[PDB]
């Protein structure tokens, strides 16, 4: 499903708290981890409306941990509104307790259609905004430029105002560079995290000739 989105969020905050995020301001997924099990009861309260139970799903992870999650009903994904979350163990013990706003946990979907081309003496990058995300004008991006043999991330370029094009300049000849792009809400009215990295695209720069 959205394994890449949950993996990015887990790498940001860790497995010791209730991780919640939205992709298109009309959804909400909350998940956490447990050592491997046990049973839990997810419940939320929207404003002053009576409490609601949420259906919980379970799944093992590569780490050997067990991941629980809940997908909120679309009717309860209103923004700019207090949403109180609670995870209670089957023993009755309180586990997690949060009060969030949907607009403050935005994690967009990863950018797609990344393409690398030569300038003729630079490298031009083009990509597409997150699928089914109409706020393209209010999305800022970030491009990664990395290499092999422990070089790591050589360049990190910020792209603003919903532009989907980038021109790289300081690249060494006879070098295979790997590019990836992440997305974020530009408008300060939203809170959240960077999207998962896009599917990488590599390109081999020519030696000087």
């Amino acid at each position: 499903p959205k394994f890449e989105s949950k993996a990015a969020l887990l790498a940001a905050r860790g497995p010791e708290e209730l991780l919640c995020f939205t992709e298109r301001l009309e959804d909400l997924v909350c998940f956490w981890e447990e050592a491997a099990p046990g049973q839990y009861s997810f419940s939320y309260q929207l404003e002053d409306e009576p409490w609601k139970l949420c259906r919980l799903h379970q799944a093992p992870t590569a780490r050997g941990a067990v991941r629980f999650w809940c997908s909120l009903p679309t009717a309860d994904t209103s923004s700019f509104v207090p949403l109180e979350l609670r995870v209670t163990a089957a023993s009755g013990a309180p586990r997690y307790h949060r009060v969030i706003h949907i607009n403050e946990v935005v994690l967009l979907d990863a950018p797609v259609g990344l393409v690398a081309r030569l300038a003729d003496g630079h490298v031009v990058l083009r990509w597409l905004p997150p699928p089914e995300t109409p706020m393209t004008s209010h999305i800022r991006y970030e491009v990664d430029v990395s290499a092999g043999q422990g070089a790591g991330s050589v360049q990190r370029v910020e792209i603003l105002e919903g532009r989907t094009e980038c021109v790289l300049s300081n690249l060494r000849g006879r070098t295979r560079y790997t590019f990836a792009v992440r997305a974020r809400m530009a408008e300060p009215s939203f809170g959240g995290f960077w999207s998962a990295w896009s599917e990488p695209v590599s390109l081999l720069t020519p030696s000087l000739d």
């Epitope: 923004s79 509104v81 393209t136």
Partner: antibody, heavy 118, light 112 residues
Framework: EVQLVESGGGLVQPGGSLRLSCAVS????????MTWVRQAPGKGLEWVAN????????YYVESVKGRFTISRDNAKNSVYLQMNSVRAEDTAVYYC???????????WGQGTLVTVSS | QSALTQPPSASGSPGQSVTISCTGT?????????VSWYQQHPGKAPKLMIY???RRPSGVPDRFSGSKSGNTASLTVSGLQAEDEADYYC???????????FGRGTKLTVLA
């Protein structure tokens, strides 16, 4: 019953200063955004400024940027709109409002009038 | 003041249905689902009638409904009544520096 009451309006000379107040009661005040919307007499509605529940972040419309200052008190349940360096085009009826679902304005106050020159 | 596009006036006999359009750009109405409609009687404060494009607050009659296609929202009153004669504004999120861009306003007149 939800109640919002504005006050502090009146005539102000161009370049002067004025402070508007909004007494709020009827809901959990410290968990919602609060906003100001003005309306020139015989004209439409214009969004002025809003503030986060904890009042950590403030946002303004471009025409009042650097001139107005919105604030709140989550103990007295009050919203303030400091109006410095007033212009003639700031002449309008200022409502304080509660931001609800989808960035809508669920509850509005009676509104207070601010008149400036032309 | 920059605003959204609304027809200046609209009319309709009791029982009929009137649709008020609201056209914006792809950066506000066509970008977010934060579309709201308001009703304002003369001398009174605006009243929320529609939030989130189509959803409707408690107290607002079933006669009122909203929709969205492209960059244009539409308010529809199916059962016209005398108490519906007022001004109608549309709003939409258009950024942090403009949390709610209203329209020019539409004066709905209930005919005989």
């Amino acid at each position: 019953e939800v109640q919002l009451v504005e006050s502090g309006g009146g005539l102000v000379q161009p370049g002067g200063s004025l402070r508007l107040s909004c007494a709020v009661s009827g809901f959990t005040f410290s968990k919602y955004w609060m906003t100001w919307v003005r309306q020139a007499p015989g004209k439409g509605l214009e969004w002025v400024a809003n503030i986060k529940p904890d009042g950590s972040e403030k946002y303004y419309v471009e025409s009042v940027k650097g001139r107005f200052t919105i604030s709140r008190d989550n103990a007295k349940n009050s919203v303030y709109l400091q109006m410095n360096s007033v212009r003639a085009e700031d002449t309008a009826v200022y409502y304080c409002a509660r931001v609800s679902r989808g960035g809508s304005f669920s509850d509005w106050g009676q509104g207070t009038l601010v008149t400036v020159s032309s | 003041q920059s605003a959204l596009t609304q027809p200046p006036s609209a009319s309709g006999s009791p029982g009929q249905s009137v649709t008020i359009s609201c056209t914006g750009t792809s950066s506000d109405v066509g970008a977010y689902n934060y579309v709201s409609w308001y009703q304002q009687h003369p001398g009174k404060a605006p009243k929320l009638m529609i939030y989130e494009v189509a959803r409707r607050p408690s107290g607002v009659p079933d006669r009122f409904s909203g929709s969205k296609s492209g960059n244009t929202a539409s308010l529809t009153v199916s059962g016209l009544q005398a108490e519906d004669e007022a001004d109608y504004y549309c709003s939409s999120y258009a950024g942090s520096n403009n949390f709610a861009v209203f329209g020019r306003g539409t004066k709905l007149t209930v005919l005989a």
